[PDB]
Amino acid sequence: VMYEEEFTKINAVCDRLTKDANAKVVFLVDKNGQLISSAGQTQNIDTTSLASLTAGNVAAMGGLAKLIGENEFPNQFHEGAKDSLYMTIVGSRVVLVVIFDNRTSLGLVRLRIKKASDELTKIFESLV
Amino acid sequence: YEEEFTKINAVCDRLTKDANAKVVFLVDKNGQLISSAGQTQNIDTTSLASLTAGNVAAMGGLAKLIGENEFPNQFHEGAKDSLYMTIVGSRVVLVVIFDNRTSLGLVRLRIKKASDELTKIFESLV
Q1: What's the rounded Cα separation, in Å, for the pair B48 and B25?
Q2: Roadblock/LAMTOR2 domain location, by residue (chain A) (predicted)?
C-alpha cells in the first residue's frame, strides 16, 4: 500500500515538462496551498510562498467563476515583460504552474502542458 | 455630480459594446466597486469586487516572487466564457467577462484603449 511509486511518477512529469516545454521552472500545488512537486530553476524562488499565493488566487478565481454561473476556469495565462506564467487545474484538486521565458513558443508550452495534465490526471485517478 | 465619474461609466459602456463583452466591472484594489456595465443582473457585484481584490493581491505577490512587475493583463479561460483582468494605474482593476466565440485579439485591443482612456481620467483626479 506504499506509493511512493506514484509520487516519483509525478516528479518525472514535472522534470520532463521543464525540459520539453523549455520552461524555466515548473510547480505542482494542491488547492489547499501545499507544494506537491517542483522542477527546474527552483533556486532563488520561494517555493512555499509561491504555492500559498497560487492557492489564494485559484480559490478567489473559483468563487468568482461560481458567481458568474460558470465552472472553474481550467487554464490561466499571465504575460510578463521577460517571463510568462501558465496555470492549469488538474482534476479540480491540483494546480500545475509553469514559468517560462517569453522567447519560448506559446503553442509549444500549451501542447506540453496538456500532455503533462493528461499524464497527471491518470496518476491522481489511481490514488482512489 | 462629478463629470469625471460619468466619463468612467461611458468607457465601461463603450467597452461592453465594442469588445462584445458579456459584462464589464471596474474594481478598486481595496475591494470597492467603482463602475459596472452589461449583464450585471444575476451577479453579486459586491462579492465579485471582493474576490477580484483577493485574486489581484495574490497575483501581485506571485509576480514579485518571479522577479516580474505586476502582470498588466491576466487571462482566465473557461469552457463557455472567459475572463480578462487589466490593472489601470496600479490602483484600479478592469474586469472583462466575454463569450469564448469573441476574438481574443479584439477584446485585448479594446481593453488597452479603455485602460489608456481610464488612466487619463484618474490622473486628472490629482
Answers
A1: 9
A2: 10-100
Selection from A93, A41, A25, A67 nearest residue B52 by Cα: A67
On whether any CB of chain A is under 8 Å from the CB of B112, the answer is no
B36 has a chain A CB within 8 A of its CB: no
Residue with cell 462629478: B2
Q: What are phi and psi of B43, to 5 degrees?
A: -120, 125
Pick the closest to residue B61 from A85, A62, A53, A108 (CA basis). Answer: A53
Residue A27 · residue A47 · CB < 8 Å = yes
A39 SS3 class: strand
Alpha carbon distance A58, B74 (integer Å): 13
B109 touching A (Cβ < 8 Å): no
Residues of B within 8 A of A54 (CB-CB) are 58, 62
Report the distance separating Cα B99 and Cα B20, nearest Å.
8
